[PDB]
Write a protein that binds this ligand. Sequence first.
Ligand SMILES: Cc1cc(-c2cn(CC(=O)Nc3cc(N4CCOCC4)ncc3Cl)c3ncn(C)c(=O)c23)cc(C#N)c1O
Ligand SMILES: Cc1cc(-c2cn(CC(=O)Nc3cc(N4CCOCC4)ncc3Cl)c3ncn(C)c(=O)c23)cc(C#N)c1O
Ligand SMILES: [Cl-]
Ligand SMILES: [Cl-]
Ligand SMILES: [Cl-]
Lengths: 123, 123
Amino acid sequence: DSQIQFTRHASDVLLNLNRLRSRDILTDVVIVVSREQFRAHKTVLMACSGLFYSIFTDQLKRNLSVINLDPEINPEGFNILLDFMYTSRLNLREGNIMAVMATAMYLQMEHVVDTCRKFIKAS
Amino acid sequence: SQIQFTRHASDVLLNLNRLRSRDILTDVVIVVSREQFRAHKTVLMACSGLFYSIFTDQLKRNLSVINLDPEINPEGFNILLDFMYTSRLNLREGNIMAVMATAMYLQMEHVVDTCRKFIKASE
Ligand SMILES: Cc1cc(-c2cn(CC(=O)Nc3cc(N4CCOCC4)ncc3Cl)c3ncn(C)c(=O)c23)cc(C#N)c1O
Ligand SMILES: Cc1cc(-c2cn(CC(=O)Nc3cc(N4CCOCC4)ncc3Cl)c3ncn(C)c(=O)c23)cc(C#N)c1O
Ligand SMILES: [Cl-]
Ligand SMILES: [Cl-]
Ligand SMILES: [Cl-]
């Protein structure tokens, strides 16, 4: 009898999900943020964001193919967070930290927000 | 910077499992002899050579129901489906052969190799 945990399995799943996203395979929503559109998998968005979890749990919104976010959100900040969702890697820089932080607050992504606070503390 | 979040992928996978448990955004039913299992095509493709082949095939990719070989043990399938969504594999002497054969059919090499390791440790 053995109960085995595969330590790299989740990362490899995420990599494959990102591969699918990159190829537009099984993507089921376009997120619109002012001057940019972004394609994604609803399930991944739900998995990574309190806002998207709330949006797509709502049966009136669950099957929408387009979601318009607040047009005051910085699209670059959104793009950085979308990339993070699919890779575990966060491209934080002095030139984007404030935008990433505010976007992560809006998306309800607490660990990123806290990481931004740590970046600010060390700056 | 590029900050790496070591627990992110695991947390995504567990949230996907929660969505599967609640039947949220599942898009396929897998039939194994008398038994049915709902899942997300994206996760199946991410975890299985067989499902990746099926859902990249022009003729099968838009199917909402996939019938597996009825010779597959549904318990074996359930164990592998749970593994896909959790990274945890329930292996014991009374299920090893069924799990291994199922993993071969599903084209899940790491699980097959782990089964061979279990045989080395126990035969
Ligand atoms: C991996 C990761 C996730 C989040 C992150 C994801 N969600 C949404 C979420 O939990 N969704 C689901 C929850 C559940 N359940 C079932 C019942 O039991 C508990 C909840 N089931 C399915 C789904 Cl899809 C968040 N909601 C709020 N806040 C503050 C967050 O931070 C996150 C943030 C970051 C960051 N940074 C991150 O890396
Ligand atoms: C995490 C995990 C995965 C597998 C596992 C998954 N796939 C399917 C697969 O590769 N899918 C994708 C591949 C690609 N790319 C694009 C760029 O070029 C390279 C291929 N893009 C998107 C997807 Cl979805 C497998 N196919 C064959 N064989 C033998 C396997 O073992 C697996 C098995 C196990 C186990 N056990 C496991 O834990
Ligand atoms: Cl909308
Ligand atoms: Cl971490
Ligand atoms: Cl046993």
